[model samples]
Target: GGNNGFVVSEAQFNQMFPNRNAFYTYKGLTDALSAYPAFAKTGSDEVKKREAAAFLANVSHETGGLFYIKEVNEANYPHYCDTTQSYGCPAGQAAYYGRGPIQLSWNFNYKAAGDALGINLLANPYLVEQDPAVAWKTGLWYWNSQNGPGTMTPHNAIVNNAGFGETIRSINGALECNGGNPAQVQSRINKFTQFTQILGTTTGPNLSC
Candidate 1:
């Protein structure tokens, strides 16, 4: 979300995503969401930057510059499966571990994201781990499309000028927003402000969910 034409300079990208050499597929992020209409529908350069701000800030918070392919806690891997779902976890118990920029998790989320992207995540959650573009897309999909446990999508929250806090609520209200954890919320806001400044945008009011 820095420089121009949806490009984050290698130097700046390294600054935001510190582990520039590690796990993330740096090449894959080169053109991650360049041609997506949904992203393009964000409308106008200023709006696009805002969208990118919310997108990267939230994602950077979740990933710490795109490091850590899976969730830090290995034990939570098996707990992500929603056994009560109608379809069940096709990828097995631990397969639903967080793997994308947004930490795409749980069996149902994997299946939904896979179906929307025309892939088979339930059958191949590792695809996210294998492809950086795909991984970013998984996060993009949620940022622009999902409304889980939040009042709006992250894209809507930012593009419509709702506020950075709404972006947090959109992504993780139950855990970080509302009367939840202030430290976690503050970290995300701090990252959002840093990225927004780098991207040449502003962090509007309601900075905390």
Candidate 2:
């Protein structure tokens, strides 16, 4: 979506997610999906549907049905900002509050994502939650950081048996419940199944990029 001028305009957002009120606003879904075209593009209608399903499913898992909104402000959290690092911290707060919409914490990530979206990460890492564009950029960054298909195939993680589900489950597990368990693993497996179901038939589709 980024390279080919496939931006997520308000109209497009409304069209893509008509029923969901959270995404209905211009500052929410429309802005967020605009940042990363690579994650959103699917050459055919079938592929598009599958990709959408997979992305949404993964996001659902990551944020527990998209409930983790706004910035998180807790001390001693791993992602909290500390001025000792070169990266500047947010005003009147440590690095922890830059939460929501892909869990955008980390000073470096805040800065980089802010730079990409033409915002000041230090001034307002919370902008990620406040701005749809920023939120979308964070989501794209997370997917790419974890080696989304555009950067690396999901199959690579699977083939290596590198605990793909565990990696995903870590988001909620660390933030919410048990650190490791069978249920989390199974949930990720189910997500994988859904992902495969979305992409299976389109395996032969042309992906020249």
Candidate 3:
């Protein structure tokens, strides 16, 4: 289950997420994302590397250059609960807020992700905060499963060669796209450029939403 066609190595991953602290690792990813084929691509180094580049770039932006595990702004924390949902926040009011790389939020997200990953995160969302692998898995789950502000999935944006901007649009395009948040968009693109260069690939076009 290792690699799963992911082209990024430990050194490369480390460079991309130097600020992740103990929250993530290449070894952990190789083992944790064992079957998450979407993280990889059509079985080529260029494709896989580009996909990895897109993935990490967006993740870096979400985590503030991979420096934070949970959401830094606590005031917005309570807003993530989504109490209107039928299932509500199984892990409590604020427990469903951002915790992992993608800052997985909402009670529905926890229930759906837990159901798919077989981890019961709805009952214990803190597990994402406590376990690094679980946290990374949650990121993957968001990328692969959930549709962010944009209708597209970040996975398809990279695999289909739709450009890095599409990935950003997919992650938080509504807030950071269409001249909404130029600085945030640029930050994500800058990270993507560095990742593409680091991975020895060119950062593709459509680098904006």
Q: Give the Å error, residue 59, model 2.
A: 1.3
Rank list by lDDT: 3, 1, 2
TM-score of each: 0.89, 0.58, 0.91
Which sections of candidate 1 miss by over 4 Å? Answer: 1-4, 25-27
* Winning model by lDDT: 3
Off by over 4 Å in 2: 1-27, 42-47, 71-79, 82-84, 90-93, 145-182, 191-209
Candidate 3 stretches with Cα past 4 Å from truth are 1-5
For candidate 3, give the lDDT: 0.79
Residue-level lDDT tens digits of model 2 in 1-209: 43543233445434433454262254655445545554545455444434444445455555555656654336545446666766556554464554554666667667766676677876776666665556766766665444421334332222333334433433343432344455654564465445445344222222111
Q: How accurate is candidate 1 locally (lDDT)?
A: 0.76
- Candidate 2 yields a Cα-based lDDT of 0.50
Task: List CA RMSD, all candidates.
Answer: 2.8, 7.4, 2.4
Residue 40 in model 3: lDDT: 69
lDDT for position 195 in model 3? 92
Cα lDDT, model 3, residue 21 = 59
